[model samples]
Target: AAEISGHIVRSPMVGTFYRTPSPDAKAFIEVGQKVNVGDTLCIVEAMKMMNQIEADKSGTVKAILVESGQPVEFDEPLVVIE
Candidate 1:
């Protein structure tokens, strides 16, 4: 079998990245998790409001590139799916 390559998912805007809705909550997605288009992958807290980062295509999550609560710049790669 051949290895499959994936596409990168980037941050839409400059903001703080969050893996979960709350500090004590589970992360929205994990490596090897299957995701469909429009699935909420994470939340970005910008200007005091929660902005959901959703999947643009369907695939299995391969990697999470950013840490929770980390500041991300616009167009920064956030996740990889294959």
Candidate 2:
């Protein structure tokens, strides 16, 4: 297999990770999904506000490090893109 190199998307604030906009909504992203700069990948609910996290570069989403409702810390790796 070819070694994949990529960048990581980190959490900017400590909060709960939400992959969808609501309970019935589909996830914002998934592995193997292609994403571009400014694409919404997920939300970090901090202080009761939904803060959308956008892609900083164009690439395929390689991994999702956190699950929905998972608590995340500032600068924690949330996703990997290649």
Best by TM-score: 2
Question: Candidate 2, residues 1-82: lDDT per residue as tens digits?
Answer: 7344476666777877777786777777778899898888777787668888777777787887766667788877677778
**Against the true structure, what is each candidate's TM-score?**
0.76, 0.78
Clashes of each: 0, 0
Local error of candidate 1 at residue 49 (angstroms): 1.8
Model 2 error, position 33 (Å): 0.7
Question: CA shift at 29, candidate 2, in angstroms?
Answer: 0.3
lDDT of each: 0.73, 0.76
lDDT of 1 at 9: 56
